């Protein structure tokens, strides 16, 4: 009847791709974020921001192509195309790293629009919005790593660039400069991700090996109806198996499947907390009591103190190339080396 | 000691640029994605068996024969979230996919460690982009190489006597 | 309309035997004419370094970044 | 009307040909260390 109601009827119409009200935000922003990433990794260089080749036009493959972060000189500028750095010039915008902030900001609103899509579809189908709650994990990772981490640092330059090997640099930059493996919030993140892949494999294989004989074929995939009411696998046998193998088994299918939600999402949320701490350099770098003991006792060696010598190697050997704006000139005499290497 | 093992392995074998570690990361990122995905859609489509005061997990009785969640409603949700043809209506095919993706991913990355044991290392793209004059243009693989160089000149700092770490 | 009955119809392949090779050629000509270097500012293999600049060009100013890049890309 | 396996044949032959060109281009031209 009303003009709002005619548009609300058209947006929520059951078609091939559901649009909804959230698709007015998701479908523009996610298309420009994905299409901006393909444009940058194919055509756009990093020669003026980082001094790198990062596109397929320059000879990069899929592993080494990236949409690189802007130059360190522009700071935390939004780098709008019309803004005071590019001033409408599209070519100069791509050369100062404007596509990075294009992909990161339109990708941030795509993740908002996708989580709003999960709320909208669950309200129409009539179910509970737990998939939107579980997507807050990936949202907290993207917000804290791609936005909140460079905002606490000097510029957008120290953010992860949108590439495969560029992400690999970001992993090793944060070991050398932040000791990110030592951080207990990354450790809780590793436990949630490896615990989530474990829960995927155990629950996947337990169901598949406690199936009921519901057909005569050796191919057991045919013996299931999507509208059936009987359980397709024996929970009593599955509980009996793991109680004698592992000592402890799930007895509740509802608690089992909530736990499959809980573990990886907690891992993404706990690791997002420690990367907010690395934005301010509030890092778990040193155990001072071991650093004080190893200072006054030159045989006290642990695997802890061996990892600090690896970090001092990373911070000296990569810093001239990874921060080229800084003009780090290290002579060979000041670079820390071991003997003969 | 585990982190010391990881860093020295990256300097000596470039495991990040090995596609078998990449399949392993897709195994554990995908596996925890599919765990959170499958765990969401079951919890989203649970059938009313409880009140607001008691826990939702008390709607399941151990040993019951009936299904505890509407798998048609979960398929209709995920079929509208992406598109209809990209969703498992077969619960047996879905749980098989939950088993296969992390296990094959961890099998492949176990055969990355086992093949980097014999120094068949990850991809080396150092100084592979070269301009017309012949000068080396660096890439992100070259900046990754500068971090590999920093670990390897500092690892086992008294153990080496000769210019190549052949062990 | 279903999907697999579209791509097996011959009317689909009458349309897309012209449109798909014309877009593949037009993507090829975007590179062959050198237009993609001028649109995106990517250096050709000749022009990473020039005769005046033998160094890696970096932008060191935020608000004159457009004008500093014009001086680094004049040769 | 075309058989669906015939479309997947020449479609997969196009994907094989294009990925062979991408792997050839890793050994020739730009990014080939030559």
């Amino acid at each position: 009847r009303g003009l709002f109601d005619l548009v609300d009827d058209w947006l929520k119409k059951d078609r091939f791709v559901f649009v909804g009200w959230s698709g007015l935000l998701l479908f523009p922003t996610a298309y420009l974020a994905a299409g901006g990433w393909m444009t940058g990794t194919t055509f756009v260089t990093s020669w003026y921001t980082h001094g790198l080749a990062s596109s397929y036009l320059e000879g990069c493959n899929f592993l080494t192509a990236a949409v690189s972060t802007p130059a360190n000189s522009v700071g935390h500028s939004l780098l709008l195309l019309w803004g005071p750095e590019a001033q409408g010039d599209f070519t100069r915008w791509c050369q100062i790293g404007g596509l990075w902030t294009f992909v990161a900001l339109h990708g941030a609103f795509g993740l908002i629009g996708f989580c709003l899509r999960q709320f909208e579809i669950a309200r129409l189908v009539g179910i509970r919005p737990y998939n939107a709650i579980a997507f807050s994990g990936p949202i907290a990772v993207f917000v804290s790593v791609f936005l909140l981490y460079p905002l606490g640092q000097a510029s957008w330059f120290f953010a992860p660039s949108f590439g495969v090997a560029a992400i690999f640099r970001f992993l090793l930059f944060l070991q050398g400069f932040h000791n990110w493996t030592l951080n207990p919030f990354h450790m809780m993140g590793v436990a949630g991700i490896l615990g989530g892949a474990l829960l995927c494999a155990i629950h996947g294989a337990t169901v598949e090996n406690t199936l009921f004989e519901d057909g005569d074929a050796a191919n057991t995939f045919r013996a299931f109806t999507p509208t059936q009411s009987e359980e397709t696998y024996s929970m009593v046998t599955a509980n009996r198996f793991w109680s004698q193998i592992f000592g402890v088994a799930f007895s509740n299918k509802r608690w089992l499947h909530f736990f499959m939600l809980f573990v990886p999402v907690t891992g993404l949320w706990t690791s997002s907390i420690g990367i907010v701490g690395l934005a301010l350099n509030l890092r778990a770098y040193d155990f001072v009591s071991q650093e004080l003991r190893a200072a006054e006792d030159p045989e006290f060696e642990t695997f802890y103190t061996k990892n600090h010598l690896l970090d001092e190697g990373i911070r000296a050997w990569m810093a001239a190339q990874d921060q080229p704006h800084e003009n780090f000139v290290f002579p060979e005499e000041v670079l820390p080396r071991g003997n003969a290497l | 000691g585990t982190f010391n093992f990881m860093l020295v392995f990256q300097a000596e074998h470039n495991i990040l640029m090995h596609p078998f570690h990449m399949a392993g990361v897709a195994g554990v990122f995908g596996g925890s994605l599919f765990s959170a995905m499958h765990g969401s859609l079951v919890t989203s489509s649970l059938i009313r068996e409880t009140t607001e005061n008691e826990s939702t997990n008390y709607g399941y009785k151990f040993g019951q024969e009936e299904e505890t969640y509407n798998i048609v409603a979960a398929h209709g949700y995920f079929g509208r979230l992406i598109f209809q043809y990209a969703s498992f209506n077969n619960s047996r095919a879905l749980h098989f996919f939950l088993a296969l993706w992390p296990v094959v991913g961890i099998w492949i990355t176990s055969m990355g460690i086992s093949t980097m044991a014999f120094n068949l290392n990850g991809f080396n793209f150092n100084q592979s982009v070269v301009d017309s004059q012949g000068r080396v243009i660096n890439t992100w693989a070259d900046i990754l190489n500068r971090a590999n160089l920093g670990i390897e000149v500092m690892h086992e700092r008294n153990a080496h006597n000769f210019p190549l770490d052949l062990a | 309309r279903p999907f697999s009955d579209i791509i097996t119809s011959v009317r689909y392949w009458i349309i897309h035997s012209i449109t798909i090779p014309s877009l593949f050629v037009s993507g090829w000509l975007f590179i062959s004419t050198g237009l993609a270097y001028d649109v995106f500012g990517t250096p050709r293999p000749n022009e990473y370094f020039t005769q005046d600049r033998q160094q890696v060009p970096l932008v060191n100013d935020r608000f004159s970044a457009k004008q500093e890049l014009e001086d680094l890309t004049k040769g | 009307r075309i058989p669906l396996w015939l479309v997947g044949l020449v479609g997969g032959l196009a994907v094989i040909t294009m990925l062979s060109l991408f792997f050839y281009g890793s050994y020739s031209g730009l990014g080939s260390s030559l």
């Binding site: - | 301009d131 | 877009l23 993507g27 293999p45 | 031209g29």
Partner: peptide
């Protein structure tokens, strides 16, 4: 009509793939 939802992905993909295929024959 579902044309411009699949063609928003397919038309730039074939354009980009024609460009990347031409890039394999660029030499320094």
């Amino acid at each position: 009509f579902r044309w411009l939802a699949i063609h928003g992905l397919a038309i730039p993909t074939v354009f980009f793939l024609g460009g990347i295929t031409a890039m394999q024959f660029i030499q320094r």
